[PDB]
Design a protein around this ligand. Structure first.
Ligand SMILES: Nc1nc2c(ncn2[C@@H]2O[C@H](COP(=O)(O)OP(=O)(O)OP(=O)(O)O)[C@@H](O)[C@H]2O)c(=O)[nH]1
Lengths: 48, 21, 21, 49, 682, 51, 46, 103, 360
């Protein structure tokens, strides 16, 4: 429409420090929403 | 006296203390 | 415990700096 | 003459800006600053929001 | 009424084509100045030859050794000023595009174009568009006429993309004898003497001139007693342009390429090239070229050695050795902190007025055209009010108007200037403005120039031209985080305008400016040269700019919803000063930081809103203030001896190579590829 | 460590040779194809439309 | 103390900004919409 | 519309909403121009606040109609104009970088 | 530090012109030859006000209190608050910022606390009715001076609030050659903490003088009741005479002294008024410096204002000598044509001037 491609640059995503690698895979918002979705489902069924 | 007591300030002159069946 | 002298001096200097700013 | 005089003074100011602009930055002027890799209590004395 | 309605629509669109913006002239109607023409092109194009031919045809007077601003009379009312710029040097290029009015853009034919022509056009298009007429030289190098028409049409269309698409460039067939074909030169002269000019904002605001000849004034007594060090008096003679330069001598001007001098004393002179109406009116009242530095007749004048060829209340007020008391006493024959003026007492006033006798008689088509009418009425008021008491005002309340020959002597010009001057380089004076003296930091918006290659950097030296003066500075580039604050970037958004701030001599808001990288001609190479273009918006003396620093810290003990964080801080006093504060994790979960753990010294506990994990890094943003480097290096171009290769401050890539270092790059900051194996929960 | 430093500086010197070795020996400069065709900011386009 | 000053200031600044932008938008719609509906009311006739 | 003509010239009088935070906003695209046929102040859209960054102040725009079809999500109705060209160069060409702005 | 001036004559006008122009000045010998020599306190506070409104300006008082080295900065202004020290009223602290209002960068929203009226210096209604119309005719459109609290000497406690919104680029050229046709007469009679009968007696005095003229006369009665009336008790009067067709204004004010009589105060201000009108020509004798500075500073053009021989006096002379010292501006005085009156058109060619302080 009125948007350059270089506007649609696609930013890349970073990862864990080295000195903290052994707690692997530094979680971003995607992984967090997976984690909290699932916990809320278990809590709901358990309350029923 | 009266004009003193008159609310022309409150009325107008708040302007003048600033600006069928 | 002149190491504790060191830390009390460090304390007073820090608080001089802050309360001055 | 005055022109070489002030040009000499500019040359001093260039050298200072030069090695300054190549040298290693200040702890606060980086980002992602860890309490190990800055001086101690500088955050206490200093002011930031 | 179909065709009537149609042609009615066409005529209305014609009218709205013909309309424009009103704008003052400040350029007179009695002795208008010689319109300046700059001949510009790549190195060995053919400027000198062209200028020799054009002078010969316009004034019957051949020439050798053309150098410096040759003015001639042309038409009944024009005086043109031919000036060739030696297009090796970008500073000659820059100031000529600032002061030119008609530029003859002289391009080769067999090349199509060069970066010199492209650079000049970009400078013109920013600092204010002169009138551009192209000529295409070197047409005699083609061999096949079909191909000749091919390249001619290609060049025409590229040129018309650049300039306004009405500029008709004409093509010069080839050199016959050292000069060009007579008929085609005649056609060129007809175009340049029919072309109509428009005024531009900088020239309407400043008094500027192009120095026609130059002379040094010191006693050689003093030169011998001091030893060719002492700064000299210099007289510079020339025309004027632009706006009435005020005559109260002591004002300040900028000699572009040298410095910022102030006028010691000025006085005017009857010009050596008058138009025929001046000729008739003034000679009948009593009863053709000029190129002083260059050859004419058969002589050219050196420093000294001429070479020849082979062969009343007004003055009462302003009379400042008088006290006002006897001023009013003679004219018949006090404090100003207070306000209510000195009357006389109540009783005398009251009896003096029992009546009201002296006071009972006091008591009792389009919008564009309208604006133009207002402006013209003001201009004619100007004129008639001068006409009352012409003499006095002509010297004193007006200064010397545009287009009157003047000589100006300046104090204390450097010996290097008067030594290493050669007449090839044009020298100009621009009068300043009482802002344009000052020194604050300016705020522009600028972009990387489109044809460039590398993006810019902050704290990276940019030579730039802004107003008359050209200088080198250390800008810092700024974004507004969606219009809250002024964060500091570190590059230039490669296809967009970003803000910029830099300490340098102030200039009025709304001003276009143009900045280059390297200006030494030793270092160009095939790349382009203009680097940023932009506009200055506001002015102040200190700005606060901020860099976002985030303190990171890692959790080391995690309960449900409450975690004890480590190594973000170094002592419990530090944490005390920062507590209660905002905090968030990488994963998006928020929290506050609450109480300083006392037994190990760094830690604190902070209560998140969800269960943080061990693979997480909490952070805290905070804006440190950053400030601007006060460096300011004027480009003293032509004091230098080699007149190109003014080498200012280097850049970061150059100095890392020069001192033999490496680019600082920490390892954990460059990205990777991330494969997350899909997570099932129990 | 100094061997690593000398390697990286030498690699930069050789690369900047391979870059700056684009200079034409003739003095007259030239128009880049970018400033010759005068086109910018265009989306990825398709040869199947190029015919 | 600085917490009190900071938070109270920031809230006041944001609320004032919201009212400012709403005043600009409301005036633009009101005045220009009067003009545009007037023009279209003319236009449907001729 | 604005006369009989299908384009009017104007001079950019000022900009509206340059402190509005959300970029590409309708309020961040309106500019306010007085038409120098009538001396009539009227507000015009631009495209694209990038293009708005190209248009400056006292700069002789060419307004045309804006003529959109259906009510968008968050627009300002009541603006009816769009800015096409500024000082001669046309905004799409400026934004796409074919041409550069002649003062 | 370059351009040097002598004596405490017209101190604040010298400072205002330094700020507007930009040239560094050096005042020296401020009542050095005096029993209690030095810079007076109210002058010091006005300098403090200048450093409040500008930015990047440096003022270095000599430590003996004689020499002031002023190097002006640029105007930023904005909103602020100032305690006018109790020796001069806020009129003397507003009239300079009135000169410097519409060239700032943001608006002027200044709050003033102190005495609100005095014999020497202008009052609230004096400014609001006599000096505002000069800028309202030079092109400033929204200026205002609110009275949140009206003081009185010698405690005051009165507050004013000046807000100036139109930030014009430069004041437009004035063209006034005909003597103005005066139409109506109005005025304000104000009282702080004394009797309404007293303000009616003031009106009686003014109307007693103005019985003769056939024009409309109307004087409002402002009595300030309750808390916002200030501490010390006082009363005062001002009259203006207004020409509607061109909106020109003439004025005179005065205040009741501790134990004066309101009747002859009203007669006094009326005879002030009529005498000022007779000595006037298109501008009051005290509105004059505002117009002249504005015409000088206005854009590059010949501007014309009719003045009178009765107005040309020694203070006018010293003003125009200051103008030449700062700006290097001649002023041309051609005589008018009508053999009856005695007037000179003052023509000033205003130099180029702008706001280089503003935003785009
Ligand atoms: N074939 C051909 N040769 C030309 C033409 N114009 C100039 N020349 C040659 O190139 C020279 C003319 O260029 P000049 O005018 O001397 O160069 P310039 O453009 O003035 O720049 P400078 O040489 O730096 O002063 C002459 O020696 C000519 O032989 C042309 O139209 N055709």
């Amino acid at each position: 429409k009125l948007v350059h491609d270089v506007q649609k640059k696609q930013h890349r995503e970073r990862s864990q420090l080295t000195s903290r690698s052994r707690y692997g895979f530094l979680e971003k918002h995607k992984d967090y929403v997976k984690r909290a979705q699932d916990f809320h489902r278990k809590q709901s069924t358990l309350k029923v | 006296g009266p004009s003193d007591v008159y609310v022309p300030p409150s009325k107008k002159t708040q302007k003048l203390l600033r600006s069928n069946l | 415990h002149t190491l504790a002298n060191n830390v009390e001096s460090k304390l007073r200097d820090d608080l001089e700096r802050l309360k001055k700013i | 003459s005055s022109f070489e005089k002030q040009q000499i003074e500019i040359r001093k100011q260039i050298e200072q800006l030069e090695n300054e602009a190549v040298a290693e930055k200040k702890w606060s002027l980086k980002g992602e600053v860890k309490a190990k890799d800055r001086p101690e209590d500088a955050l206490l004395t200093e002011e930031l929001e | 009424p179909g065709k009537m309605a149609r042609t009615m629509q066409r005529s209305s669109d014609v009218n709205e084509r013909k309309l424009h913006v009103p704008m003052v002239d400040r350029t007179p109607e009695d002795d208008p100045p010689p319109f300046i023409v700059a001949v510009v092109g790549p190195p060995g194009t053919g400027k000198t030859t062209l200028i020799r031919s054009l002078v010969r045809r316009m004034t019957k007077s051949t020439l050798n050794d053309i150098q410096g601003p040759i003015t001639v009379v042309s038409g009944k009312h024009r005086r043109l000023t031919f000036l060739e710029c030696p297009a090796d040097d970008l500073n000659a290029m820059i100031d000529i595009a600032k002061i030119a009015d008609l530029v003859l853009l002289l391009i080769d034919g067999n090349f199509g174009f060069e970066m010199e022509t492209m650079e000049f056009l970009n400078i013109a298009q920013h600092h204010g568009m002169p009138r551009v007429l192209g000529v295409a030289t070197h047409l005699d190098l083609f061999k096949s006429q079909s191909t000749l028409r091919a390249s001619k049409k290609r060049l025409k269309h590229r040129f018309w993309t650049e300039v306004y698409q009405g500029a008709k460039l004409f093509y010069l067939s080839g050199v016959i004898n050292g000069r060009y074909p007579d008929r085609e030169i005649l056609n060129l002269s007809r175009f340049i003497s029919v072309m109509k000019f428009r005024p531009l904002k900088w020239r309407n605001e400043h008094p500027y001139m192009l120095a026609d000849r130059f002379t040094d004034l010191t006693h050689p007594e003093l030169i011998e007693t001091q030893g060719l060090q002492i700064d000299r008096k210099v007289a510079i003679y020339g025309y004027l342009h632009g706006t009435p330069l005020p005559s109260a001598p002591g004002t300040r001007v900028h000699i572009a390429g040298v410095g910022d001098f102030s006028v010691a004393q000025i006085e005017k002179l009857p010009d050596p090239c008058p138009t025929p109406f001046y000729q008739q009116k003034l000679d009948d009242f009593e009863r053709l070229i000029y190129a002083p530095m260059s050859d004419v007749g058969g002589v050219l004048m050196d420093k000294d050695a001429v070479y020849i060829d082979i062969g009343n209340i007004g003055k009462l007020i302003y009379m400042d050795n008088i006290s006002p008391e006897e001023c009013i006493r003679r004219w018949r024959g006090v404090d100003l902190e207070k306000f209510v003026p000195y009357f006389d007492t109540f009783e005398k006033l009251a009896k003096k007025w029992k009546s009201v006798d002296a006071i009972k008689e006091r008591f009792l088509d389009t919008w564009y055209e309208l604006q133009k009418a207002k402006i013209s009425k003001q201009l004619e008021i100007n004129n008639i009010e001068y006409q009352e008491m012409t003499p006095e005002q002509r010297q004193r309340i007006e200064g010397f108007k545009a287009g009157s020959y003047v000589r100006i002597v300046f104090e204390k010009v450097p010996m290097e200037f008067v030594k290493n001057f050669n007449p090839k380089f044009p020298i100009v004076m621009g009068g300043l403005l009482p802002t344009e003296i000052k020194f604050g930091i300016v705020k522009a918006r600028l972009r990387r120039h489109r044809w460039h290659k590398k993006i810019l950097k902050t704290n990276d030296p940019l030579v730039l031209s802004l107003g008359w003066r050209r200088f080198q500075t250390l800008p810092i580039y700024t974004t507004t985080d969606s219009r809250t604050r002024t964060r500091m970037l570190k590059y230039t958004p490669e296809h967009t305008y970003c803000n910029a701030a830099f300490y340098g001599p102030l200039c009025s808001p709304n001003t276009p400016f143009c900045g280059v990288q390297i200006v030494a001609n030793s270092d160009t190479g095939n790349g382009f040269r203009i680097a940023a273009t932009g506009i200055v918006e506001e002015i102040d003396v200190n700005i606060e700019i901020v860099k976002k620093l985030k303190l990171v810290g890692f959790p080391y003990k995690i309960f449900k919803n409450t975690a004890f964080i480590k190594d973000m801080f170094s002592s419990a006093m530090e944490v005390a000063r920062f507590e209660g504060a905002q905090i968030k994790t990488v994963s998006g979960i928020r929290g506050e930081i609450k109480r300083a753990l006392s037994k190990p010294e760094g830690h604190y506990r902070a209560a998140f809103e969800d269960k943080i994990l061990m693979s997480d890094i909490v952070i805290l943003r905070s804006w440190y203030p950053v400030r601007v480097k006060k460096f300011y290096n004027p480009v003293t171009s032509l004091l230098l001896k080699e007149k190109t290769e003014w080498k200012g401050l280097r850049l970061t890539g150059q100095i890392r190579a020069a001192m033999n270092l490496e680019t600082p790059s920490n390892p954990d900051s460059a990205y990777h590829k991330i494969e997350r194996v899909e997570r099932h929960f129990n | 460590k100094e061997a690593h430093k000398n390697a990286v500086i030498a690699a930069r010197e050789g690369k900047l040779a391979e870059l700056a070795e684009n200079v034409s020996g003739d003095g007259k400069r030239a128009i880049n194809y970018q400033i010759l065709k005068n086109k910018g900011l265009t989306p990825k386009r398709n040869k199947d439309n190029r015919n | 103390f600085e917490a009190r000053q900071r938070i109270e200031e920031k809230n006041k600044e944001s609320s004032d900004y919201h009212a400012k932008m709403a005043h600009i938008v409301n005036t633009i719609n009101t005045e220009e919409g009067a003009e545009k509906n007037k023009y279209e009311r003319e236009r449907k006739l001729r | 519309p604005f006369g009989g003509s299908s384009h009017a010239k104007g001079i950019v009088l000022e900009k509206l909403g340059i402190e509005s935070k959300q970029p590409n906003s309708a309020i961040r695209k309106c500019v306010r121009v007085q038409l120098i046929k009538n001396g009539k102040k009227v507000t015009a859209f631009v495209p694209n606040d990038g293009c708005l960054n190209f248009v400056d102040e006292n700069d002789e725009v060419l307004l045309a109609g804006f003529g959109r079809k259906g009510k968008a999500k968050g627009d300002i109705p009541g603006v009816r104009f769009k800015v096409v060209k500024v000082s001669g160069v046309s905004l799409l060409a400026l934004w796409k970088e074919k041409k550069e702005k002649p003062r | 530090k370059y351009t040097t001036f002598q004596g405490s004559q017209n101190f604040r006008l010298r400072i205002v012109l330094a700020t507007l122009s930009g040239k560094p000045i050096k005042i020296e010998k401020i009542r050095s030859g005096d029993l209690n020599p030095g810079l007076k306190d109210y002058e010091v506070s006005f300098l403090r006000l200048i450093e409040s409104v500008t930015n990047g300006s440096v003022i270095e008082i000599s430590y003996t209190g004689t020499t002031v080295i002023y190097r002006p900065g640029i105007i930023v202004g904005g909103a602020s608050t100032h305690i006018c020290p109790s020796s001069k009223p806020v009129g003397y602290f507003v009239e300079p910022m009135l000169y410097l209002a519409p060239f700032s960068k943001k608006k002027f929203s200044i709050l003033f606390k102190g005495i609100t009226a005095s014999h020497n210096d202008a009052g609230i209604e004096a400014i609001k009715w006599g000096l505002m119309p000069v800028m309202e005719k030079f092109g400033v459109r929204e200026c205002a001076l609110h009275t949140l609290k009206r003081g009185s000497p010698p405690l005051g406690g009165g507050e004013v609030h000046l807000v100036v919104d139109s930030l014009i680029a430069q004041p437009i050229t004035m063209h006034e050659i005909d003597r103005p046709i005066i139409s109506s007469i109005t005025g304000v009679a104000y009282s702080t903490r004394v009797s309404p009968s007293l303000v009616n007696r003031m009106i009686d005095g003014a109307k007693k003088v103005l019985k003769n003229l056939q024009c409309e006369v109307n004087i409002t009665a402002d009595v300030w009741r309750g808390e916002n009336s200030g501490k010390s008790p006082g009363w005062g009067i001002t009259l203006v005479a207004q020409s509607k067709q061109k909106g020109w204004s003439y004025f005179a004010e005065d205040i009741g002294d501790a134990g004066s009589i309101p009747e002859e105060l009203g007669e006094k201000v009326a005879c002030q008024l009529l005498e000022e009108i007779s000595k006037s020509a298109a501008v009051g004798r005290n509105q004059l410096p505002l117009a002249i500075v504005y015409m000088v500073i206005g854009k590059e053009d010949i501007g014309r204002l009719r003045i009178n021989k009765e107005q040309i006096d020694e203070r006018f002379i010293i003003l125009l000598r200051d103008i030449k010292k700062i700006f290097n501006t001649e002023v041309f005085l051609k005589p008018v044509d009508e053999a009856d009156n005695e007037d000179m058109i003052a023509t000033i060619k205003g130099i180029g001037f702008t706001n280089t302080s503003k935003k785009i």
